[PDB]
Write a protein that binds this DNA or RNA. Structure first.
Lengths: 177, 68, 367, 377
RNA sequence: GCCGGGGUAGUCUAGGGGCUAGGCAGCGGACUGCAGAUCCGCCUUACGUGGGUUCAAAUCCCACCCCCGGCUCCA
């Protein structure tokens, strides 16, 4: 990759600001870990996460000037279950014909009891819970995929992971983001 | 490349400094090319040169946490 | 305490980068990258580099002494307070900045205005009228504490021959304060050439620094009253309140200083931008107010064609604000169509053309 | 190609300092460290003025009312610091020649601002000098009466809520109650308290409160807050006559640019950190208890109810007189271990604060000092 | 720019944390050509955008954009 190969294009200012903000956030580590700035495994993950997310935003900027980047990798045939629809939305813009479903929260309901607050709000959630567990079918039932991944963005998603494939096999996370 | 692979290491302070200085230098283009921020071939090379050099400094930082 | 803090979490949205700002007060306060790097080094805090900087400002303005301030208006009040006895008269032009009146009132001083050589359309100041006003006041028994000239006014952007008022003040034995806001950091200034006893400057208006900072330059003659120290704390200067200037504004001021010294040598290029804007916009029916040709970048236009459009547009006078906003241009007050003020100082020539063509396309599309 | 008449490249020695290579122990510095929210705000607002159009959105109006509730005062105004806030009330409330009654621990700016407002000053003395140097708050009455009996007028009562030499907290309510029935305006200097610990202006019956943004509200210098009751609004917010909107004591200023932006940006971080003031005291008391083991004597009121610590350090003298660095040794030994904020050459006393530091940084500093006085005989 | 109304699928209108809104000159298919009823999917990622809160947001929070009304001629 050479700057000399750069071609006329537009600066994405919103992408540039996200980049510079990320370094500004990362600047706290130079304060909070002064003078030695030695990081442990958890601090290293948190810090490098910032640097890496910044380099991605920089890469989106460079893409506007002819440079090309290989954009993760995604099997577009598999089904992808997800709790948030911010994640759902994000998946559908990175890849529209990519097929995903939104359970809108934790699925099972003593799975829901695992997070808290009792409780015939639950069998009030009677339809819902299974409405996610109905609709998941209406997608799998006819396209029915080879295998079915569940995206994980935090630890409570892997609980949804376990129930989803008590029923139907396969896990993922971060690798497509 | 995943942040989850990050290993204990030291932050190269100067290398971080150079990185953010370069984005500061690049920040000029957001002013001077406002509002449409459309760059020509000369401006593109000058600008992307800054961005890329920033990324090389960032990679050197990531090198100290087990990344290659 | 039952208050929503969410309003303060996204101040991360001032639009200096996605809009061209034509507002005169901000054109010369745009930070160079050398200053931005300095800010990164001193977000929080860090004085010999300051003292050397003051020596440099003294030379750059060709003056004996200099002190840091929180802006031009603070510098005015410092002089009025430390030099004039309460009740004294300050003599200033009618194009004076409101802060001159306010600093005087705060120093509980009296104010007399020097009037216009001509009003519409140039609104020039009768500088020799300073002798008259002084005479008429001294004849009435009132004593004049201070002579004040706003080197360039913030309403029309007229330049004034400060040396004329300087000579007047010298032969009537009265201290002369030159308000070099809108001037120091834009055009070269020689304080003793204009025989000024004092110079105030706005770091954030014309010296590419972050607000609020400024300079007060003065002669050795008045140094004792300006830099007078507290009786209890002899190191601390009373009028400075002990400051001890720290924080980002003084850092940006110092870091921008070489860029400022450079850009006053290229002041003519900015005038060339300014005169280009005048000539071009006059073709569509704008009329430049103030002295002609411009010897400052602050342009005030009489804009009858804009006001006529306003009377037929659903948006009324605010149509012009919207139309500029659609094309990434701001810094001109919303809803005002009879007059507009604007500067293209520091903009790239390409940005200057863009502004002119945008305005031309506004008036043509909007009849 | 420089335009030579004088040096200009000495100015780019500003381009890189040592701000992130050291722990700064300077107490005036600890409460002014910028949080990332504020740094982002700086990036958005470098340039000159920040006025989209004094009732502003940029929510300055909303901020001023929120900062008022936060202090439980009627009104508030932005200032260039606690200095200017004092001078303002001294200039707009007192008449010239009046006496300002203040504690003997008062910050020099209280004296300098009084002299600038052409006011006289009387000091309320200690309930005990060495080593606590605690103010006799009840002594405010005797001084006032002493002055009223001599025909002198007292325009203002001033209490340094926490002094900057010893970091002693003071029961502001008592001086407030003295001021109430003796009918004299009360200004509480909340430099070093507002933004660290919670402060209720009405409960301490304060008429005025000055706050320092850069000292204790995680903002850039110079900024601050003047809070005041509706009773004194007319004189503080008195307007220019030629210009009915512009307030005279502000110099009409759209109190401008960067520092006020950082103050608004750091505000949520500040509100949350005063709720955790006890955790910073814990860090503080850990330092005191620990450095006493090697011969540092905490001065001032024990135990610390503030993070500013002043140690009497005889052992540092004992070492200075025998080392070739001769009193600079401590400063050099600290920099060698990435620590600063202590004045060079001083060994009889030191002032420090670990406010805002991570606990790991706190341990580091303590161990550092111990190993200094250990290695240096 | 300020004060109000608003933006929900090719557009029409509800809902104010979770009950998978529903009606058409919109288009294919469920014998053929004319006329009306159902199944459907249909452009399907329905909620103007970006953040935030939550296990879960059209719904609550912050900021910004556009459409409709209105109001302003310097400090």
């Amino acid at each position: 990759i050479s700057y000399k190969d750069a071609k006329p294009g537009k600066i994405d200012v919103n992408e540039f600001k996200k980049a510079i903000y990320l370094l500004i956030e990362a600047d706290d580590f130079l304060y909070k870990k002064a003078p030695k700035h030695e990081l442990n495994e958890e601090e290293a993950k948190e810090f490098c996460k910032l640097i890496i997310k910044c380099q991605e935003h920089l890469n989106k900027i460079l893409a506007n000037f002819g440079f090309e980047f290989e954009e993760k990798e995604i099997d577009e045939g598999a089904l992808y279950i997800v709790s948030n629809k911010k994640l759902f939305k994000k998946l559908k813009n990175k890849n529209p014909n990519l097929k995903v479903v939104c359970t809108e929260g934790m699925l099972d309901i003593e799975d829901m009891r695992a997070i808290g607050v009792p409780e015939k709000a639950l069998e009030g959630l009677k339809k819902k819970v299974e409405i996610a567990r109905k609709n998941v079918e209406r997608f799998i039932e006819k396209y029915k995929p080879e295998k079915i991944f569940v995206v994980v963005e935090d630890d409570k998603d892997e609980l949804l992971y376990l129930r989803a494939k008590n029923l139907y096999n396969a896990e993922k996370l971060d690798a497509d983001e | 490349i995943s942040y989850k692979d990050a290993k204990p290491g030291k932050i190269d302070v100067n290398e971080f400094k150079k990185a953010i200085y370069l984005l500061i230098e690049a920040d000029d283009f957001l002013y001077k090319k406002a509002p449409k921020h459309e760059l020509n071939e000369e401006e593109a090379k000058e600008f992307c040169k800054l961005i890329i050099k920033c990324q090389e400094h960032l990679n050197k930082i990531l090198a100290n946490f087990g990344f290659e | 305490l039952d208050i929503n803090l969410d309003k303060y979490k996204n101040l991360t949205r001032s639009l200096t980068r996605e809009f061209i700002n034509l507002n005169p007060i901000q054109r010369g306060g745009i930070l160079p990258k050398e200053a931005k790097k300095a800010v990164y080094e001193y977000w929080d805090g860090y004085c010999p580099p300051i003292k050397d900087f003051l020596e440099d400002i003294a030379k750059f303005l060709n003056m004996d002494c200099a002190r840091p301030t929180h802006g031009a208006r603070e510098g005015k009040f410092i002089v009025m307070h430390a030099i004039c006895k309460e009740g004294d008269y300050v003599v200033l032009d009618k194009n004076a900045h409101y802060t001159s009146y306010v600093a005087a009132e705060r120093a509980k001083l009296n104010v007399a205005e020097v009037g216009y050589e001509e009003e519409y359309p140039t609104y020039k100041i009768n500088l020799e009228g300073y002798k008259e006003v002084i005479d008429n006041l001294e004849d009435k028994g009132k004593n004049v504490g201070l002579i004040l000239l706003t080197h360039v006014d913030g309403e029309y952007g007229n330049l004034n021959d400060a040396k004329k008022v300087g000579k007047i003040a010298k032969e009537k034995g009265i201290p002369f304060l030159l308000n070099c806001a809108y001037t120091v950091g834009r055009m070269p200034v020689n304080g003793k050439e204009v025989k000024a006893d004092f110079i105030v400057a706005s770091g954030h208006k014309s010296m590419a620094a972050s607000a609020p900072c400024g300079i007060l330059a003065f002669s050795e003659e008045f140094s004792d009253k300006i830099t007078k120290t507290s009786e209890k704390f002899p190191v601390k200067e009373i009028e400075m309140l002990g400051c001890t200037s720290r924080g980002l504004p003084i850092v940006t001021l110092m870091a921008s200083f070489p860029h400022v010294v450079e850009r006053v040598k290229k002041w003519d290029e900015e005038l060339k931008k300014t005169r280009y804007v005048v000539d071009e916009l006059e073709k569509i029916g704008f009329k430049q107010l103030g002295i002609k040709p411009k010897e400052h970048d602050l342009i005030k236009f009489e804009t009858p064609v804009l006001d006529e459009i306003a009377k037929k547009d659903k948006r009324r006078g605010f149509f012009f604000y919207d139309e500029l906003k659609k094309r990434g241009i701001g810094g001109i007050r919303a809803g005002v169509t009879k007059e507009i003020k604007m500067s293209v100082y520091g903009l790239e020539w390409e940005q200057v053309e863009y502004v002119v063509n945008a305005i031309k396309e506004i008036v043509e599309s909007c009849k």
